[PDB]
Design an enzyme around this catalytic site. Structure first.
Site, short mmCIF file in Angstrom:
data_model
loop_
_atom_site.label_atom_id
_atom_site.label_comp_id
_atom_site.label_asym_id
_atom_site.label_seq_id
_atom_site.Cartn_x
_atom_site.Cartn_y
_atom_site.Cartn_z
CG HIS A 80 40.93 28.36 48.91
ND1 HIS A 80 41.97 28.14 48.03
CD2 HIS A 80 41.28 29.45 49.64
CE1 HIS A 80 42.91 29.05 48.22
NE2 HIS A 80 42.52 29.85 49.20
CB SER B 75 45.71 32.01 48.09
OG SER B 75 45.36 30.67 48.41
CG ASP C 19 41.54 24.77 46.69
OD1 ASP C 19 40.47 25.22 46.23
OD2 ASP C 19 42.29 25.44 47.44
#
Ligand SMILES: *[C@@H]1O[C@H](CO)[C@@H](O[C@@H]2O[C@H](CO)[C@@H](O)[C@H](O)[C@H]2NC(C)=O)[C@H](O)[C@H]1NC(C)=O
Ligand SMILES: *[C@@H]1O[C@H](CO)[C@@H](O)[C@H](O)[C@H]1NC(C)=O
Ligand SMILES: *[C@@H]1O[C@H](CO)[C@@H](O)[C@H](O)[C@H]1NC(C)=O
Ligand SMILES: *[C@@H]1O[C@H](CO)[C@@H](O)[C@H](O)[C@H]1NC(C)=O
Ligand SMILES: [Mg+2]
Ligand SMILES: [Mg+2]
Lengths: 704, 233, 617, 366
Positions: free
Chosen positions: A469, A638, A515
């Site tokens: 992402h 992330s 993801d």
């Protein structure tokens, strides 16, 4: 048998041992099971008193905070601050009076294991014939004159045991006899990384080499204790340790004459140095693989004296032989210090010392020609006893005590890893220079210009694993190893199922299923002390890293790494240009249902009806306040790896994807965070077809 | 039982006669009247007493200046006061007199233990501390004698702990007791006149002073020799 | 046609020394050279410079010379001199000056005043200005440590476990200098007691022949504040030199209640032991108090000493007035009155019945009395007595002195008197100064200016000029008193007449002794739990280097005699002053000699040599 | 001129000490400290002169006077009395000097939990010649544990006795001895001290002394263990605790007596558990207790015993293995063989055998 009622434990957990003849407790981190770690079965139906060190009753077993010892005395200066006791991660500073120079660590931080960081601070006037021996934090020192032949004595606050020399004398050389003392709790332990470094650092000198004299020789005596106290499980586990010690040593070039002795009520010899074979590591390793715990079951006492006399037999002679005062002797003892027959084992050392002419001349120590190392099995170790046996050498540590027999294997397993091939996945050697990146080599910073800063893991020499992402649509750069230099990338590999708009139709913005992404660099990478790969699920490298046979299946790995319980994991977060290991728990057991359910509180999902819509079988789940309060990830974290730290190695099991609550300010703390603030991670086990494929030509070697 | 658990009582031990031997610099910006003010933080030692802080500054145009002493008064509401002699003889039974100071304006019921030390013979043993329990009127002192017999030479800790019943008032003291061996310290004096020149131009004196005879000596005690040299005026 | 050189009578190392060069009856701009050579052999040039003397600077320059100690080191004693030379057009002056190696005043601070065998003695050395040797001596006078120290880092001294007991000395000196500052400290096997004992005497003295008793009030406090309760034993005696003779029958046992007790010595008991008063003259009365806690747990032994056995409560001193007057002028008499120990005594009235002059003493125990000297007298007997309203005439103190007349050069009858009205002088004060002249009419018209020196700490500090408009019998000048003039300063002033005669005078002025700067430790002043966080403020001068120390009141109460103080510092300075007298002199040359100055003239009027740097006693 | 080189060689080190003395540093004294009474070799090359003072410090025995009250005689006794616990305290003292001693002080501490009888004390303070600091009173007891009585004088010819009752305030386990000090103003140093206790002669804590080495002997006496059955499983555990060095079967040969101490001479018949003492059967084993404990122990000559003890309690007696009997020592009567027949001892002897066997054969369980 015994009833398992009332055996609870605040903010913690427990697991039965020995079929149930002696249970044991497990706390988070920086917490210790009060008052005792294990109980022992009484034939009444109730397990045991809830006594303590001393003999008084407690009514609700809890996990207390680990405490660092408060300085009793610091000479020739002040320290800041003064607290009754010190909490984890607390800082204490030392300043010197006028006329005194500080040697040692000016600042010291309290570590998650109750030991202070750095070394002992000392304020010295440089006037003593020797230095100021100092006062190791936790001890009390008697004797303040450091002229030639003066002594100082140390002792510990009652309720603790002393490790090292209790008395030290100033010598002609300028150094102090014996070794720097330290204070030990019943709950304190040596991490395997510490034991590994400490042992080799003593055993050898520095790519290390074992120092033999010209035309000399070494004799290694492996004495294992097989009394009833040890147990069966904890025994064959020590046999393994000795196997790996054999390999590791042999790889230092020198062929040593071995000796093998297991003991109990009686000593049995399995190899004598006198024999022409000894030297064959395969011979000895085979003899070792022979030994069974049932060899002593009958007469199962703990007569350590006899056991060392066995070693005193293998040393003696008819006239003195040729090359005797040129042979280095090294004893490896693996007991729990609980001798109960034969008397004081020490009287045998003092017997050996006089047989080798050790410490019998002020012009020659010959202290180098004898080393006695003692390894303490686990809780119920008598640290007073395993200490009085170990050698006391300045600036070296010869006595060790580790949490469980599991961790002791971890020691010798990590030795064969220093051993080499930096391409070895998830391998971090604990050099004391800290130096950040040295402790997480696989970490990759990412920046995609527009700005955005994700994270990633180095899986091969070409590939960096991250979250999908972070990208959509030269424009992107990767930086590693604390290298300013950012690297050219060739192409991004999105997972074919990934689609951030998969369900924009149902009023649900971002759909983070599948993801994951791979980044092939344009330039091969060269590993090093600050750049290494991390293990991936379902490789031979992992099977090996976990200490399993080549006949281990992919499912068996999952059942080992991601079992149906609360899993201790960790991720890597950047807080002001420093990398720190945040410890979290993967809710994969009974708590897994409620972890996912917190998904509909996450931003955007105000229209979500059944959470199965946005939480798929690809996600793992961390965060929240059950069982414990877990730290949370950030936007900046992330894409980073979600790691599991098993058997002294680092295997990545997931990729950091999304969170239910933006808990970052930046800063982070808050300090306290909603109970519903979970973190979801892509479970790499659920994306193996895509991984095996894109990473086929990379040396990782998958399975199914 | 009503009392504070021993482990909760931390004994005081840090009793320096002098400390904080530090130097600071007045680098801060002066004020309207040309005075530079520097805040300074530190922690007190364990002594229950009054500390006296003495400053002495020097500047290049204002010479030496001695400040008027700042006193710091340190005190607990309830505490033990222990006076030790400079030393006691080995093997020789002595009495140590502690004092419980109640400065709370009410009557209290206290517990006083003597901690066990292998260096001493006393009422305490490895398994059972010697415990007394008694009341103290509001604002009274009270003496608590402890009989002990030093068994080892050297410096050894005497530790006493006290707690008030049904309240949060506790105090502990750990002081060092110097224990010298039996007998009287004597000294033998040998004198040697060093004059190498007395033996010719290329002069050497070689003096072998052998082990001195001293057979009054109590066996197993330390011997100390000082070799001093003074020059001729 | 008249040239004068004036320098400090003694030059210090290794620091700045101002000198004075003057041209009288001249106004032609010159170029003077200033050479400083060793003496006698002039083997080298210790310091050298060239200076410009012109009418803008009033034909008068103040060069700064500096004599390095590297260049004149010679471990001689017997001693050393140097020679100052001034050369120029028509100007050839030179003065042989005495040399001192004490570059400045050093002072020693030790952490405690009393030590235990086997512990460190921490110390610092301070200098008034900005190398040094520090020595340790055993109580038997043996040197056991000698080091060259850097002024901002010292090595702690460590007493051996088998040390020698008694009073130890720390000595700080500049190498070659027979002058030294000296700190003391005791090494005793001793436990610090848990309480302090303070002593307060009834009277500051004891009448040798009186009728009254003597009380000693006692106060005992635990070192943490609260009051000791126990018993005290007091034994009185008489201290003759250092031989104590006790009054056995005086031994009293006394209760300490709420920290207070009161012990008495009966005049009866005293008379019985010392009937012959002759045996008591000039001796002191002491009291040896011994306090025990009620529990028998602790004991303190103090002593009240130095209570003089005297005939009067006061002493009169003429140490602060000139011993030379000027006929026909108001003479300024400064009476100094002290208690028997030497301290100043305020509010004591004094009288000279011969002049019927009165005055009471101020806070510094002094009174300025103006006397009018007959026009003719040459010798001058002054008697002064105390006149305190609380004393019978028989208990008044008295003293006498004799002031001689200032000899004029050639018998000119030309005089100069400098006068200062202000008293209790503090820094910040503005001070009226008075130049008074009397003498020959043909002379007093040539006086066109007064030259003055402001001497402080052995050094010329400031020099100035005061104009005299013709006719002016009296010329006033203001003078700002700055912290530079502590502890005291000298005002020396002179005028010239016909380029031949020098008429001069000097005054000694006292300044309120304090610090030149500030230093204050400030705290909140609340009671403290042991091991608590503390914050204290340090307030002082910009760029100050502050040395700190915390002392248990258990010590610091002990050996007050050994502690360093602001007062002890100034008393060392004052005892080291090169000026020996309170003002004036037997004559012109005598005014300089006495003020610690040297002068040479082109007429060859020369201040005599100096036989040592310490002033006669 | 003066210029001297010095070398000082000491067997305690290799590198000798070199000194240079001259005019600039001759006032300075050079010192060398050693901890050994060994030969010293000094050389001196050079010009000048020097005096070398060698001072050796040691500890010398003194004429067998110890504390000895030098300036006073002091007798303190204490005796029980009928009072329908409570005792009477008699203190006799006399100055040993040429004349009566000015301002004398009698320092007194109470036995644990005892206080001075108020009335008796109030009666003591009365006098023109005395002083006692103020004391509070409750339940007819002076609330002072330390009681100082200040006398104006004390005779040097006739003894001066004084006495008062002491009563039991709080009742505690062990009674610490009390003490009495005597000193005067002109004699505040060598304080005369005696202790007192109801159960003790000289009021001394119990210790045992071989030479100058003393160990605490305990206040309670150690007694012969007596079960009439042995729980072999548990009796085994006890002998297999980590601080038990050995387990012997012994026979009691003699009972010798030295300085108020009982020496029980044991011969070792069987080593049931081997201890540090490598060859115990060839030597006589001395077990030492103080005589005041004859009867609590009740050892009889030529009986057999199961003795097991702790290494700690080994005594520094030369050429003789000696132990101090402690609470850390276990002694039990071992029935003779000709006794095992008598039914009174049958099953006891079986558990005894099943014990000596299980240990000598299998050793400890853990
Ligand atoms: C670590 O945490 C504990 C709190 O559990 C701190 O304990 C201090 O002392 C007691 C116990 O809670 C409290 O009364 C104080 O409030 C605590 N600290 C403060 C604010 O004084 C302990 O101090 C902490 N470790 C540190 C900061 O040294
Ligand atoms: C110790 O810490 C302080 C701030 O916490 C810092 O100023 C000092 O430099 C540190 N000393 C070191 C890093 O050794
Ligand atoms: C210090 O000065 C005086 C002068 O008499 C004296 O005590 C001593 O000689 C000096 N001390 C030295 C030179 O160390
Ligand atoms: C005290 O000593 C005397 C001898 O001077 C003696 O008569 C008396 O019995 C003794 N009292 C005791 C033993 O307490
Ligand atoms: Mg065992
Ligand atoms: Mg002044």
């Amino acid at each position: 048998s015994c009833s398992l009622e009332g055996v609870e434990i605040k903010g913690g957990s427990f697991r039965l041992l020995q079929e149930g003849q002696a249970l044991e407790y497990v706390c988070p981190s920086g917490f210790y099971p009060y008052p005792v770690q294990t109980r022992t079965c009484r034939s009444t139906g109730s397990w045991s008193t809830l006594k303590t060190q001393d003999q008084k009753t407690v009514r609700k077993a809890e996990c207390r905070a680990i405490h660092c010892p408060r300085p009793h005395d610091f000479e020739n200066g002040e320290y800041w601050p003064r607290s009754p006791y010190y909490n984890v991660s607390d800082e204490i500073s030392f300043h010197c009076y006028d006329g005194y120079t500080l040697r040692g660590s000016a600042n010291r931080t309290c570590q998650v294991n109750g030991r202070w960081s750095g070394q002992t601070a000392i304020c010295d006037n440089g006037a003593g014939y020797c230095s100021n021996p100092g006062i190791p934090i936790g001890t009390r020192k008697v004797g303040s004159q450091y002229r030639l032949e003066d002594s100082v004595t140390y002792h510990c606050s009652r309720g603790l045991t002393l490790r090292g020399s209790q008395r030290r004398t100033c010598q002609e050389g300028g150094s102090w006899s014996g070794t720097e003392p330290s204070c030990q709790d019943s709950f304190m332990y040596d991490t395997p990384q510490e034991v590994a470094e400490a042992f080799l650092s003593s055993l050898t000198e520095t790519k290390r080499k074992i120092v033999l004299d010209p035309s000399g020789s070494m004799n290694i005596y492996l004495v294992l204790d097989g009394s009833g106290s040890i147990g069966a499980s904890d025994f064959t586990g020590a046999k393994k340790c000795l196997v790996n010690l054999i390999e590791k040593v042999a790889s230092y070039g020198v062929k040593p004459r071995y000796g093998l002795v297991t003991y109990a009520t009686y000593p049995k010899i399995w190899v004598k140095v006198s024999e022409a074979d000894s030297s064959n590591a395969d011979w000895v390793t085979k003899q070792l693989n022979e030994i069974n715990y049932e060899d002593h079951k009958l007469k199962s006492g703990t007569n350590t004296k006899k056991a060392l006399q066995a070693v005193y037999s293998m040393m003696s002679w008819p006239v003195p032989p040729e090359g005797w005062n040129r042979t280095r002797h090294v004893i490896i003892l693996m007991t729990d210090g609980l001798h109960n027959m034969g008397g004081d084992p020490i009287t045998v050392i003092d017997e050996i010392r006089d047989l080798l002419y050790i410490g019998k001349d002020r012009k020659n120590p010959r202290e180098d020609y004898l080393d006695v190392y003692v390894f303490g099995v686990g809780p119920l170790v008598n640290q007073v006893n395993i200490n009085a046996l170990a050698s006391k050498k300045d600036n070296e540590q010869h006595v060790f005590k580790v949490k469980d027999m599991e961790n002791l294997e971890d020691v010798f397993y990590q030795m064969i890893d220093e051993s080499q091939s930096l391409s070895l996945c998830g391998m971090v050697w604990e050099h004391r220079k800290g130096t950040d990146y040295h402790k997480q080599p696989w970490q990759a910073k990412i920046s995609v210009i527009r700005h955005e800063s994700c994270m990633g893991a180095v899986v091969s020499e070409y590939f960096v694993l991250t979250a999908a992402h972070c990208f959509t649509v030269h424009s992107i750069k990767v930086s590693v190893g604390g290298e300013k230099r950012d690297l050219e990338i060739e192409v991004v590999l999105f997972h074919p199922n990934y689609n951030i708009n998969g369900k924009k139709e149902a009023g649900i913005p971002e759909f983070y299923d599948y993801d994951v992404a791979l980044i092939k660099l344009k330039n091969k990478l060269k590993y090093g002390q600050t750049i290494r790969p991390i293990c991936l699920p379902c490789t031979e490298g992992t099977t090996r890293a976990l200490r399993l046979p080549p006949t281990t299946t992919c499912q068996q790995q999952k059942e080992e790494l991601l079992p149906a319980q609360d899993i201790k994991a960790l991720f890597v977060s950047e807080e002001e240009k420093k990398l720190t290991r945040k410890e979290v728990y993967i809710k994969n057991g009974d708590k897994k249902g409620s972890c996912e359910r917190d998904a509909q509180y996450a931003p955007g999902y105000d229209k979500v009806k059944d959470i199965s819509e946005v939480v798929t079988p690809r996600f793992l789940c961390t965060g929240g306040v059950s069982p414990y309060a877990d730290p949370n990830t950030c936007r900046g974290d992330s894409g980073g790896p979600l790691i599991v730290h098993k058997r002294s190695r680092f295997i990545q099991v997931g990729v950091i994807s999304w969170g239910v609550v933006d808990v970052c300010k930046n800063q982070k703390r808050q300090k306290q965070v909603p109970a519903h603030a979970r973190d979801f991670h892509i479970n790499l086990f659920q994306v193996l077809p895509w991984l095996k494929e894109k990473l086929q030509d990379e040396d990782l070697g998958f399975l199914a | 039982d009503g009392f504070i658990a021993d482990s909760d009582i931390i004994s005081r031990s840090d009793f320096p006669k002098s400390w904080l031997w530090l130097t600071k610099d007045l680098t801060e910006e002066p004020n309207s009247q040309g005075i530079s003010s520097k805040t300074m933080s530190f922690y007190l030692r364990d002594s229950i007493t009054t500390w006296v802080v003495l400053a002495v500054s020097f500047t290049p145009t204002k010479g030496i200046c001695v400040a008027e002493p700042y006193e710091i008064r340190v005190m607990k509401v309830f505490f033990i006061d222990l006076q030790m002699p400079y030393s006691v003889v080995k093997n020789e039974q002595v009495e140590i007199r502690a004092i419980l100071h109640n400065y709370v304006n009410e009557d209290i019921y206290v517990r006083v233990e003597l901690l066990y030390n292998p260096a001493f013979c006393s009422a305490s043993t490895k398994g059972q501390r010697y415990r007394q329990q008694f009341p103290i009127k509001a604002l009274s002192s009270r003496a608590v004698p402890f009989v002990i017999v030093p068994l080892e030479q050297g410096l050894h800790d005497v530790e006493i702990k006290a707690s008030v019943q049904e309240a949060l008032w506790s105090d502990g003291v750990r002081k060092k007791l110097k224990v010298v061996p039996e007998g009287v310290q004597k000294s033998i004096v040998t004198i040697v006149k060093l004059d190498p020149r007395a033996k010719g131009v290329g002069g050497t004196q070689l003096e072998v002073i052998k082990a001195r005879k001293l057979d009054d000596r109590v066996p197993d005690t330390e011997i100390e020799t000082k070799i001093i040299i003074q020059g001729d005026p | 046609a008249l040239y004068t050189l004036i320098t400090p009578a003694v030059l210090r190392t290794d620091t700045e020394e101002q000198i004075l060069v003057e041209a009288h009856g001249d106004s032609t701009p010159k170029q003077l050279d200033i050479f400083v050579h060793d003496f006698p052999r002039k083997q080298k040039t210790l310091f050298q410079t060239r200076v410009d003397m012109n009418p803008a600077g009033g034909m008068l320059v103040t060069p700064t010379i500096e004599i390095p100690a590297k260049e004149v080191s010679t471990d001689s004693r017997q001693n050393q001199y140097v020679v100052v030379q001034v050369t120029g057009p028509q100007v050839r002056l030179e003065k042989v000056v005495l040399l001192s190696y004490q570059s400045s005043f050093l002072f020693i601070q030790t952490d405690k005043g009393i030590y235990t065998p086997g512990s460190p003695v921490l110390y610092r050395v301070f200098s008034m200005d900005h190398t040094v040797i520090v020595e340790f001596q055993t109580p038997e006078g043996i040197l056991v440590s000698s080091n060259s120290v850097d002024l901002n880092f010292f090595w702690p001294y460590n007493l051996p476990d088998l040390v020698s007991l008694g009073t130890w000395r720390i000595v700080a000196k500049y190498e070659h200098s027979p002058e030294n500052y000296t700190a003391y400290f005791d090494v005793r096997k001793y436990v610090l007691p848990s309480f302090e004992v303070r002593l307060q005497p009834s009277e500051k003295f004891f009448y040798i022949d009186g009728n009254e008793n003597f009380h000693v009030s006692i106060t005992a406090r635990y070192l943490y504040g609260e009051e000791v309760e126990g018993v005290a034993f007091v034994l009185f005696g008489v201290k003759i030199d250092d031989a104590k003779k006790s009054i056995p029958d005086s031994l009293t046992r006394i209760p300490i209640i709420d920290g207070d007790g009161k012990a008495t010595l009966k005049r009866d008991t005293f008379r019985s032991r010392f009937p012959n008063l002759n045996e008591l003259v000039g001796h002191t009365l002491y009291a040896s108090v011994t306090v025990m806690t009620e529990s028998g747990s602790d004991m303190v032994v103090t002593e009240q000493s130095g209570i003089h056995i005297v005939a009067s409560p006061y002493q009169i001193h003429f140490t602060k007035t000139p011993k030379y007057f000027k006929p026909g002028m108001p003479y300024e008499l400064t009476v100094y009155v002290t208690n028997p120990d030497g301290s100043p005594a305020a509010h004591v009235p004094v009288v000279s019945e011969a002049f019927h002059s009165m005055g009471t003493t101020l806070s510094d125990g002094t009174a300025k009395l103006i006397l009018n000297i007959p026009l003719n007298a040459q010798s001058l007997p002054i008697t002064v007595r105390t006149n305190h309203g609380d004393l019978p005439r028989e208990r008044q103190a008295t003293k006498s002195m004799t002031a001689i007349a200032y000899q004029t050069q050639g018998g000119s009858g030309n005089y100069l008197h400098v006068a200062i009205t202000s008293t209790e002088i503090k820094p910040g004060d503005n001070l009226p100064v008075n130049f008074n002249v009397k003498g020959n009419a043909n002379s007093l018209k040539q006086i066109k200016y007064f030259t003055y020196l402001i001497l402080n700490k052995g050094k010329i500090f400031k020099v100035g000029r005061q104009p005299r408009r013709d006719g002016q019998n009296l010329v006033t000048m203001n003078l700002h008193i700055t912290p530079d003039l502590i502890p005291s300063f000298r005002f020396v002033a002179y005028y010239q007449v016909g380029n031949n005669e020098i008429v001069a005078d000097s005054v000694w002025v006292d300044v309120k002794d304090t610090c030149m700067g500030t230093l204050v430790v400030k705290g909140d002043n609340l009671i403290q739990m042991p091991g608590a966080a503390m914050k204290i403020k340090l307030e002082g001068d910009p760029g100050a280097r502050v040395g700190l120390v915390a002392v248990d009141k258990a010590v610091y109460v002990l050996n007050d005699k050994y502690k360093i103080s602001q007062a002890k510092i100034w008393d060392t300075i004052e005892k080291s002053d090169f000026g020996c007298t309170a003002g004036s002199g037997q004559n012109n040359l005598g005014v300089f000699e006495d003020a610690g100055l040297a002068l040479t003239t082109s007429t060859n009027l020369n201040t005599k040599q100096r036989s040592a740097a310490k002033c006669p006693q | 001129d003066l210029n001297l080189d010095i070398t000082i060689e000491l067997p305690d080190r290799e590198v000798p000490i070199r000194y240079r003395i001259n005019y600039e540093n001759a006032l300075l004294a050079r010192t060398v400290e050693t901890k050994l009474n060994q030969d010293i070799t000094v050389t001196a090359s050079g010009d000048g002169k020097a005096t070398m003072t060698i001072l050796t410090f040691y500890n010398a025995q003194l004429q067998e006077k110890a504390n000895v009250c030098n300036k006073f005689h002091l007798n303190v006794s204490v005796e029980n009395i009928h009072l329908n616990g409570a005792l009477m305290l008699k203190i006799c003292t006399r100055y040993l000097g040429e004349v009566d001693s000015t301002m004398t002080i009698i320092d007194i501490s109470m036995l644990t939990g005892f206080l001075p009888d108020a009335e008796d004390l109030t009666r003591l303070s009365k006098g023109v010649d005395r002083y006692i600091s103020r004391y509070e009173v409750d339940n007819n007891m002076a609330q002072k544990v330390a009681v100082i009585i200040y006398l104006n004088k004390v005779s040097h010819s006739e003894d001066e006795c004084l006495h008062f009752k002491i009563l039991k305030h709080f009742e505690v386990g062990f009674i610490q001895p009390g003490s009495v000090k005597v000193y005067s103003y002109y004699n505040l140093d060598e304080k005369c001290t005696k202790f007192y206790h109801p159960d003790k002669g000289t009021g001394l804590l119990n210790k045992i002394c071989i030479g100058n080495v003393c160990r605490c002997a305990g206040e309670t006496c150690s007694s012969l263990n007596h079960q009439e059955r042995i729980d072999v499983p548990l009796q085994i555990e006890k002998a297999c605790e980590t601080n038990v060095d050995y387990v012997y079967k012994t026979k009691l040969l003699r009972i010798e007596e030295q300085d108020g101490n009982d020496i029980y001479v044991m011969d070792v018949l069987e080593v049931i558990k081997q201890g540090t003492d490598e060859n115990p059967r060839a030597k006589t084993h001395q077990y030492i207790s103080q005589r005041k404990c004859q009867e609590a122990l009740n050892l009889k000559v030529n009986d057999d015993y199961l003795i097991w003890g702790s290494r700690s309690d080994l005594l520094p007696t030369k050429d003789k293995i000696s132990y101090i009997i402690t609470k850390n020592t276990w002694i039990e009567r071992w029935p003779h063989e000709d006794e095992c027949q008598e039914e009174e001892f049958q099953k006891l002897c079986d558990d005894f055998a099943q014990f000596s066997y299980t240990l000598t054969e299998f050793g400890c369980p853990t």
